[model samples]
Target: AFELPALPYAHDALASLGMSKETLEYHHDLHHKAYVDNGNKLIAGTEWEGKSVEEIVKGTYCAGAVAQSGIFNNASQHWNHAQFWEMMGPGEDKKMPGALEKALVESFGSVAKFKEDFAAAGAGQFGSGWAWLVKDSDGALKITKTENGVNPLCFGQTALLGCDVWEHSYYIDFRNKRPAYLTNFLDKLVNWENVASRM
Candidate 1:
């Protein structure tokens, strides 16, 4: 059984950084909480009862199906949101560290080009999904997207950074301006120090 972790910063911390307190209340307190609660219920008496969240995600993913199982959905989302909260922080002068910038340039031509592609990946996803900067098994950095709760763990990649493109993630703050949200996230909200540490 899993419990929802508290946000690393206060609910009001990001209010000045594009994401509002109202958004965090709903997105984290409500949406994220539901996943934790449901995931616990779904795995209570099954073989997955005590498995790690990562194990549950890989085990229950309904490959090739229109939708994944409820267990997988909740568990994977739990893992994703946990990472999501830590991936961002309140900041106006955020800058990508030199090492991460170097890596991004090496992989995607330039840091600007990397942001262009990352934002494009999030915006191009037709429905609810996530955009990721990942290190593949071969140690190459790549930008990828996954529908619903699917994440880098499923494909054996190291998630360097990820952003939720789900409507729930941006509805209160950006409304339907997902592209605007993505832009602000990259420019303002990202905890680049955290991203660099993942590298």
Candidate 2:
């Protein structure tokens, strides 16, 4: 059964850094909880039962299929949000490590350009979706976006960093200004060490 993991910090920890406690409450306490609960129920009595979340996502994903199965939707969202929470922090020790910095520069031209591209990818997503910084099978980093619950896992990429562009993720804090949210996410919220650890 899928379980909703606790936030790495208290809900209020991120409030000072752009994401408010209310946003976490709605996004994590409610939205993420629903995905876990729904995913658990949907997977019960099925071959996916007791499978890891990643396994369930890859197994159930329908290639080029927009209306994915209920099981896939909930399971993928569960995995996405689980990563999302850890990808951000309270803006305390938020320095970009030199190794990850070198990788970003190597991949995106410069650290500033990487932030520019990442924010653009998140803001450019048409609707409810996510923007990702992934390490491809070739060991190169790439920026990609996925609509709805689809994610890098579906394409066999390692998700180094990701930001939820869903309305519920930022409506309370940024309110129709998703670009601002993305900028804040990269500039203030992202846990660069966590991202580097993924690589």
Candidate 3:
């Protein structure tokens, strides 16, 4: 099972933005850990025993009702959140790289527009899910929203950045104002360098 990723900065570092230490404590330590633990237990001694979380997620992502469904959801969510945590920071000074920058400009007109679209998609997701920037098979950049743990990887795309839209992600600090939360995530938390590197 994957261990929870350490916060890139102090837990309270993002205060007044989208998250706080109190929320991070419960969400990261309790909720995220529970999923990983439960996923491991469900996959233990099963056919997925030796597979990596990413492999298992992509493999059983579209399967029917079975022990693997829970396993896939938990494990994939774990993977996505781990990446999401690392792909964020407490401050904002980074710039998008050439490849990603060019793509963003071509696809969305400008970086600012891209941010607007991405945040809108994140805020608009109805329930616990994720908004992502991904590269399709033909290397086209696109933004997509996934329900629960489903990800573009299951569809053979490369996820560049992901933002969790689950209420637990922002409720402790932002409450019902998901738009504000989405803005903070793009303007402050998102790590442009990580997305550039992935691109």
Candidate 4:
């Protein structure tokens, strides 16, 4: 059974950046919590009980299986949401760190290009999913997207930053304009320090 991690900032912390307190109350308090609660129920009295979230997710990610298991959905979603919360910010710490900037430039040609590609990948997902900035096993940084609760954890990559593209994440705040939401998130919501630290 997994417990929801307390939000790193106040519910109202990101208000000025377009993420309202009401959105947080619903998305974080309700949606993210449902993942934890449901994950716990699915894992109760099973081999997954004492396992770490990463372990549970990797263990349950049936290779090539369609429509996955309840435990896998619950656990993977919990992992994704946890990363999503830590991935955003209080608004003050929005500057991209120097190393990460340099790396993005190296990988994608420029920081602007990186954001362009990332936002495109996010907007192009076409359904509930996430866009990621990940470090591959060979130590290359790349932009990728995952459907549903799937994340880099399943693919043996390191998730440096991840943006949740589920409608629940931005529907109330940004309506149906996911592109606008992705741009706002890149420019205003990301915690560059947290992202850099992961690198």
Candidate 5:
């Protein structure tokens, strides 16, 4: 059975930013824990048993399965949130690494433009979903959005960075301001070196 991975940093580490210990406690300690728990339960007796989370995600996704099966939701969310936690840090000292910056500039014309596009994508996702920065099969960077637990892995792409736009991800800290949460994610929280590592 899959287990909740330990948080990379302490719960209070991101408090200076909008993220608070209470938010992390709920988001990571409860919300993420639920996904891991549900995923493990659903896969235990099925064909998905013992398969890696990535494999389960690909096998279960469909283009418009806005209301996908429980197994798919659990598996995909577990994978997505795991990446989400690692992709953020304390936000004070982080900066975009040169390689990732160059790639973003080349793809989106400028880093500022990329953030604009990325933020727009996240904001535009109706209901619940995620915004992503991915390198497509052709090795070009692009911004994409998916409803609910959907992610880049559902297609053949490399997910360099992703921001969760789901309410629970930022509701406690930012309330109904999804755009502010996204802005802070881009400008404050994202761990750029971690993003570069995926490319």
Candidate 6:
């Protein structure tokens, strides 16, 4: 069975920026766990049982005709949420690493501009989904939004950063003020070093 990804900090460590212990309890303990559990169950006793999550995501996504669309969506969402959780940290003390900073400057004008762009992307996604900074096939940074369980990984891009724009990510703390949530996510919660390391 796929395991819950270990949080890099305590459950309430990101408090005030939108996440609280109670929120994490539901999001991590229930929502994320259900996806993982269902995905594992769907693949059990099949050839997909031994495949990595990424492999499964790549192989089955948008295959046009398959008996496992629900399985693929659940498994990919599980993987995406795991990665999304790891891409955030508790505080601003963790700065963007130097290499990533240079890359950001080159791609989006500056670190500040990158934050703005990411925030804009998050705000613009119509409904439940994600905002991602992904490397395109040409190795250039591009901001894209994925609806529901879709992700940049499906398009063969490296996901440098991600922010969950789903209402569930912020409803408890910010209510319907999704822009506030997006700003907090960019300014306070994002872990740039995590994105840097991936690059």
lDDT of 4 at 47: 87
Off by over 4 Å in 4: none
Candidates' TM-scores?
0.97, 0.98, 0.91, 0.97, 0.97, 0.92
- What digit string (tens of lDDT, one per residue) describes model 4 on residues 3-65? 899899999999999899999999989998999998998899988899999999999998787
Model 3 ranges off by over 4 Å = 63-68
Top candidate (lDDT): 2
lDDT tens digits by residue: candidate 5, 70-121: 9999999999999999999885868888999898888999999999999999
Q: Tens digits of per-residue lDDT for model 2 on 9-39?
A: 9999998899999999989999999999999
- In candidate 3, position 178 carries an lDDT of 86
Number of the candidate with higher lDDT, 2 or 4 = 2
Give residue 96's error in model 1 in angstroms.
2.2
lDDT of every model, 2 decimals:
0.93, 0.94, 0.83, 0.91, 0.91, 0.83
In model 4, which range of ten residues has the least summed lDDT?
87-96
What TM-score does structure 5 among the candidates reach?
0.97
lDDT of 3 at 4: 69
Worst 10 residues of 2 by lDDT: 88-97
RMSD in angstroms, candidate 6? 2.2
lDDT for model 4 comes to 0.91
Q: What is the lDDT of residue 80 in candidate 4?
A: 91
Report the alpha-carbon TM-score of model 2 versus the true structure.
0.98
- What is candidate 1's lDDT per residue for 1-199, written digit by digit as tens? 7989999999999988899999899999999999999999989999999799988988898778879989999999999999999999986798889999989889999988998899999999899999999999999999999999999998989999999999999998889999999998988899999998987
Quick one: best TM-score, which candidate?
Answer: 2
